[PDB]
Symmetry: none
Subunit: 273 residues, 4 copies
């Protein structure tokens, strides 16, 4: 039962400067919940008990959010806003948190590698708080994955279809159909050109990796900005053995860009009715 | 010339829980800028050099934002994003921030008092970052106000005409027209009925108060749920002598409510053309 | 009453590195109280109501100390220990705290000028937490110095009779006698040597400056570094205005040195019985 | 070789309030460094590479200390003090730091349990910073134990010969002598009465445990006061197999008490001769 979930949060959020200079990206709110909370809730719902978070520059806000705020929950008690803290409070009492500082920030590659100090040798989950996913009366994307994992016992990378045009700015899969939405990764091509792309199935910020990935990342030569492309690592692993590519159910808003963030907040404002 | 501007950032932002239990209301971003940067930029543009900020227990975020650092600053200057830090950086090297910890929010009146310790004894501007104001080819709102002060030499409480029934949600003014958008305040009623509101000129979060307001504040008895309110203090100062009300040119979004918050976002995102 | 009290506290406290890399000097404990608490405790008993602290590098520890923390006031209430917090709990509820960060540290002179943002134009007390003073059935050194300001309403600075030896570690005075232990400063020489020191009365971390000092500090030109320092200013001030020296009652331990710091704690440990 | 060392640091530092309401106990300074530095320095000297620290609410300063500061690094450079950060620099450069947040301080048993998320299934050391150990030209205490472990391949709980009055507050051993100050534990008793105490052999804040302790701990019944403590878990191990009580070499100051704290202070001060 996947017990740990690794949240890479050392990113700089350059697209959101200047606020992202003091408030870590993962803390930007949707309507009033920080991005990171959706992410932890999703994971907790998938059965994870330990939330291993990789922090960067401003981690104070991150770590503090998951600390039990005694003051306001009492100074809000007996009022009509104790409902607002029910959820977060739940996570805090039911989850265990661990942290580790990302060395010289080198993307998602070293984030997972750095996080080995939090996971150790055991399969684990990985969530990108920036990929805000919601499931239309379906289990949270991660739960769909932990469940799938119980059957495949291997690394699972969540994929989704993008417009054949959009393909150039994604990590694309090329696998063997196996089941209703399951595939066997056979290769992965980072940001491929329209006529090279082996498919319209893009990789999303949701993984379930087997411990060996660590060792692999550790062997991956770094590219631009000595970033360790996970696609390289996964491709490496994929060529070694069977690993799944799963087409999750639900919607994903890319809160990576300012556009997605806005789109993301409106939808959720509308949700509230 | 007015040089200090009091920023009553001491509320709890309950309406924005849970995120607001770690990230202060004035720090919530619009697009990629905190509600407070907008306010401080307006203050500066109006001619202020000292930014007095009253705070509560969650100041760290608010104080860190305006402190000079270089770690997450000059760092990622390999990407075009080093222009995103131009404004804030300029604010930091051009303004002087000062803070005063308030023990427990007891209203804007109580806050204006605590702030005395930073303003001392001289006319000063007040801004509520929750009232995000923007002006179409017109000076900032506080500027219009400080400039009007050069002439009137008295407390200037900003107003805006609301709709016939939205009155019970603001502090309404009973005035006497003096000139284009300027009234002498004969009285001030807080959140009145429709059949009681002497006007539909509601008060916004933009003031310019003369030192005597401090003396008047401390003398103002409790009332509406324990709190001392600028409404009575203003009404007092108003009866003792001439204090003006100003119908500012420009638009203001009430981010005090998530609706205004969201709307403001879309509004400022849209404006990204 | 002298309302405000300045606390110059940014000096890198380089004599206490490496711990000073994260714990501000003023927060180093004597027995179980941070140094700064003795100072604020003094100022409070001297009638001071506003503790204006001039922070620097690490300071959330400084600002946080005087914030009323509930987590522990709750999780402790009912225990014998529910007393240790009675002193600071009192300082918190009775005093008011204002802050201002320093661009960077450059000595007492520049620190005080910085504090201008918290004083304006009123005489103000200055206390250097490093100089830990204790009175044997006497009012605090400040309370003593306040009585003098009542009488002469000019700057009052505490002096201490030292060993001719250490005359080189302090700024020494020279002034006509006024009352027993009270001198009108005629001149001040910076860290002179035994053979040609005007006296053995040294200046301690205890002042009461008249606002004009700020202008003098600004007018001041760097001398013993690229920094400006109080001795030169106090000279000028005593020459233009008038400033009285006071030979106080009680002991003072210099915690600017680790030796003095060690003695202090031993002293206060014995004193515990 | 033991790779990870657990550091319980959620302790409420009750005997050190009020400064402990803000400054974590593990961060109080001996001379010029926090209790925790000596701990990590000791674990590092015993070959440990990971420093798994269990923290409470006040832990920002603890995380920051082992964080590399590019600010004071510049200051230092060129300065006559460009060597006060050598000690901490070395540590930071040769150690990995992971942190786990403990919700409520319910003793050492719980603490170690919580740390399961950082250690994983492998033997590990444990060091209580409150117990400052220094060795008269001998390998660090925790090192004397990792070596001893290489041979005995089992849990090793460090012990010290103490005055009979001290017994009432430590876990005391009673074991079969095996070698040079090495014993097989036949039983352990928490804070025994001076007369029933099985020996003057007290247990110190030094452990090297084997993974099974984790399982034991979860099964272990909360003993004297809703708390679970290693004393029972270790006994349980003893019934099951051989575990050692090692009579280390070097001195141990119990900074758990202000009396020991003060003592430890004076010591290291003289030491700097």
């Amino acid at each position: 039962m996947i017990k740990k979930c690794l949240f890479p949060a050392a990113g700089y959020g350059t697209r959101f400067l200047p606020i992202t200079k003091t408030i870590p990206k993962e803390m930007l709110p949707i309507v009033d919940k920080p991005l990171i909370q959706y992410a932890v809730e999703e994971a907790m719902e998938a059965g994870c008990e330990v939330m291993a978070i990789v922090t960067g520059r401003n981690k104070r806000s991150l770590e503090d959010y998951f600390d039990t705020s005694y003051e306001i929950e009492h100074q809000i008690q007996g009022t009509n806003k104790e409902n607002a803290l029910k959820s977060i409070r739940n996570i805090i009492e039911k989850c265990c948190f661990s942290y580790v500082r990302q060395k010289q920030m080198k993307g998602l590659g070293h984030a997972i590698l750095t996080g080995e100090a939090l996971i150790g040798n055991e399969p684990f989950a990985v969530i990108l708080a920036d990929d805000l996913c919601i499931s239309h009366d379906h289990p949270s994307v991660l739960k769909q994955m932990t469940s799938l994992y119980q059957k495949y016992q291997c690394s699972i990378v969540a994929i989704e279809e993008v417009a054949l045009e959009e393909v150039s700015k994604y990590g694309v899969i090329r696998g063997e159909w196996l089941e209703e939405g399951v595939y066997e990764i056979k290769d992965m091509v980072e940001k491929p050109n329209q006529e090279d792309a082996p498919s319209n199935l893009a990789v999303i910020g949701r993984y379930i990796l087997t411990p060996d990935i660590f060792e692999i990342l550790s062997e991956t030569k770094p590219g631009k900005n000595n970033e360790i492309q996970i696609t390289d690592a996964l491709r490496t692993q994929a060529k070694r053995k069977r690993i799944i590519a799963y087409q999750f159910k639900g919607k994903r808003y890319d809160c990576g860009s300012v556009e997605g963030y806005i789109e993301a907040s409106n939808a959720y404002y509308k949700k509230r009715l």
